[PDB]
Design a protein around this ligand. Structure first.
Ligand SMILES: [Cl-]
Ligand SMILES: [Cl-]
Ligand SMILES: [Mg+2]
Lengths: 128, 142
């Protein structure tokens, strides 16, 4: 990868990541998408870069595309259940409530992030 | 590897072979069986190609991912194995076998606290009593 060869300096990469989120926070989604795609080309193995791109797909209602990337993000992180939470949201939008339930249940059972667990439980409470 | 392919596919967001149903389910089953035929006979290099082929076609298949992860673990490519085991768990969230194997990989990667976390999860959440015994044996050694 480009990261493996140190093709752009670390501080420049940080800046691009911040600009990507600046675009995202301002609702400049097309530009944010370009920037997160750029970041994920540069380092496919970076969980936060992958999470930024998955968030763009989720915003654009490309819920399967987002869920796929979230699954990769979880795997690379190991112990961050934030991607699993967002996968749950995607599964609800895909009309797969039992898959969604499974995601939120995993957050509740495995995560030590108390605020994330509250959010997961709020979704579980709503699922019929 | 199989993860970079999945990510490149997601980035490019174009038509994949899966999107067009380029290989039918029964053909994929046959290739999977041939992959394991190679594996069972110790032809690991050919098995690896076949599981890589399967994971290019349909990366989000627990059984395909598990086959490939096992090969990397045998080859002492422990980071690669751990990553794929974590994918396997994510896709099949009720089977703690991949979490157990991730624990093993983490110990070999000199990450005992990550390993401990994996084996603890097995103990707390798995209903596989024999797997729990194995997980506890590793916890006792940490
Ligand atoms: Cl469902
Ligand atoms: Cl890879
Ligand atoms: Mg129990």
């Amino acid at each position: 990868t480009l990261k493996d060869i140190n093709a752009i300096p670390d501080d420049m990469m940080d800046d691009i990541y911040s600009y990507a989120y600046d675009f995202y926070n301002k609702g400049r989604i097309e530009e944010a998408e370009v920037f997160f795609r750029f970041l994920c080309i540069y380092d496919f193995y970076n969980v936060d870069y992958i999470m930024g791109l998955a968030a763009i797909y989720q915003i654009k209602e490309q819920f399967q595309q987002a869920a796929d990337l979230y699954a990769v993000a979880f795997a690379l992180g190991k112990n961050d259940y934030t991607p699993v939470f967002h996968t749950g949201q995607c599964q609800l939008r895909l009309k797969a409530p039992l898959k969604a339930k499974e995601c939120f249940e995993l957050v509740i059972q495995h995560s030590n992030d108390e605020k994330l667990k509250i959010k997961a439980q709020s979704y579980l409470d709503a699922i019929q």
